[PDB]
């Protein structure tokens, strides 16, 4: 189904039984990989659709989940 | 950083010139050379415009715009 990435976020998280705390520690070896910070506070606001993540922060999410970028932008598309 | 040979590829074959590209997204050129040369990072609503715009497969996106270098 075309959606927006906030969807798969929570598409993720009801998925794989996770929450906003575990996917930013999942992220910590990304955030310092890749160079692109994301805090608690900017999560929540992906999550509760407050605003869309960028080029950045959608790449940051799509390693550290190890899904495809596409589809974490809510592309009908093959989730890997 | 991002290596947009691809995408660049997409943009003269489809627009021609990167001042058609950026009228099509509706973008200053300006704002569309700084993405283009990683200066600054795309925005989600950018990214799908392209997409319409190019008429690129949704599924070669992490090819076009997340292709580490």
Redesign the interface.
């Known amino acids: 189904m075309q959606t927006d990435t906030s969807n798969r976020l929570k598409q993720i998280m009801a998925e794989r039984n996770l929450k906003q705390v575990d996917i930013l520690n999942l992220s910590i070896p990304f955030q310092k990989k890749f160079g692109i910070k994301l805090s608690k506070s900017t999560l929540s606001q992906y999550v509760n659709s407050v605003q869309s993540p960028d080029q950045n922060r959608i790449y940051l999410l799509a390693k550290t989940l190890g899904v495809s970028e596409a589809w974490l932008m809510g592309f009908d598309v093959p989730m890997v | 950083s991002?290596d947009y040979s691809s995408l660049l590829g997409k943009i003269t074959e489809k627009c021609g010139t990167q001042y058609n590209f950026a009228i099509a997204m509706g973008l200053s050129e300006r704002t569309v050379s700084l993405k283009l040369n990683d200066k600054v990072?795309?925005?989600?609503?950018e990214?799908?415009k392209a997409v319409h715009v190019l008429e690129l497969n949704?599924?070669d996106?992490?090819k076009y715009?997340?292709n580490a270098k």
Do not use: R, V
């Open positions: 991002y990072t795309w925005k989600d609503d990214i799908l949704p599924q996106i992490p715009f997340f």
